Amino acid sequence: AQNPNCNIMIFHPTKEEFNDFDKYIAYMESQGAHRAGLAKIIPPKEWKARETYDNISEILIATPLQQVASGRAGVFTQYHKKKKAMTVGEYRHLANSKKYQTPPHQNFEDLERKYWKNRIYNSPIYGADISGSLFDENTKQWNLGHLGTIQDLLEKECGVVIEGVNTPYLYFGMWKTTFAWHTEDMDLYSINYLHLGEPKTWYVVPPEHGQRLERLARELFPGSSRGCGAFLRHKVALISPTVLKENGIPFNRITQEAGEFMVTFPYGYHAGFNHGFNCAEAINFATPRWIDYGKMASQCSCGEARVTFSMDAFVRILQPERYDLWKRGQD
Ligand SMILES: O=C(O)CNC(=O)C(=O)O
Ligand SMILES: [Mg+2]
Ligand code: NI
Ligand SMILES: [Zn+2]
């Protein structure tokens, strides 16, 4: 078995190997990359996402989210308070202001320490989940807006035609902006490209050990666990690396820098934070190996998790027993 310890692997594809996306995901899996739940892909030196980022200030963040924490430093939940719209230009200025800027620090390790120590006492503002793309239309390789769709994957594998579309999303982050512990909708893969700015630190649990995270989460968020048998789908819970280590949960961490891709694999729980002003683009995708995970994915039916239009068909085809209950939670 390749990568039995479930370490996060880092890949350096050549320009030749960067031509066929599907083939390269399959190659990574042949090397055991999926065991970690997360991989990093450094693009070949000849590749570029776009020519410059000079003209992005006019993108609108229609609903910036202020991330307000409750709990203790290592075990907290966060809720999103909607703020008034602002442009990327305005957001970047806000990120760099004395109230929100990255503090002085020695290295990534020191900054991580300051994150887990102090995150709960601040409420950073995240421009998340903005439909759109920053890839140049002429970028042919690993262009997240030109991937084969999940609907076409399901059709190719299962022979059923379904409605739905699959498009990327932009994330504008600042110091301490946080993504809570989650897997993807229907335990899909995700791919995330850090277009510009400061880094993003990631924590991941190997898919083979995801249920150990869930069990600990039920213990740490006992009211939430009573409200819903899949409350991590709400994407509100944070658990620090110190807490995970105390409770023997296997995990890994890695920091993503501008110009790098991360791939999350089916049922790879991940969480993390941004180091300072940045812009990422991410999209879900599927492979044939995903199908069995989609059939087994937990679902939130309490009403909180509320997701896209396109998830309907996935639940309807892959999880027909669950469909009625799940849809009641959507409606
Ligand atoms: O970048 C973020 O805020 C969150 N991204 C992801 O969870 C992902 O790409 O799967
Ligand atoms: Mg613009
Ligand atoms: Ni994710
Ligand atoms: Zn729920």
UniProtKB/Swiss-Prot annotation:
Residue list for modification PolyADP-ribosyl glutamic acid: E16, E17
State if Transcription regulation is listed as a keyword. Answer: yes
Q: Is Cell inner membrane found in the keyword set? A: no
Note accompanying the cofactor annotation? Binds 1 Fe(2+) ion per subunit.
Q: What is its main location?
A: nucleus
Q: Where does the chain bind Zn(2+)? A: C228, H234, C300, C302
Q: Which reaction does it catalyse?
A: N(6),N(6),N(6)-trimethyl-L-lysyl(9)-[histone H3] + 2 2-oxoglutarate + 2 O2 = N(6)-methyl-L-lysyl(9)-[histone H3] + 2 formaldehyde + 2 succinate + 2 CO2
Gene Ontology MF terms in the entry: chromatin DNA binding; damaged DNA binding; histone demethylase activity; histone H3K9 demethylase activity; histone H3K9me2/H3K9me3 demethylase activity; metal ion binding
- Describe how it is modified after translation: Ubiquitinated via 'Lys-63'-linked ubiquitin chains. Deubiquitinated by USP14 with the help of TRIM14 leading to stabilization.
* Gene Ontology CC, one term: blood microparticle
**What family does this belong to?**
Belongs to the JHDM3 histone demethylase family.
- The protein's name is Lysine-specific demethylase 4D
Organism whose genome encodes this protein: Homo sapiens
Q: What portion of the full-length protein is represented by this chain?
A: 11 to 341 of 523
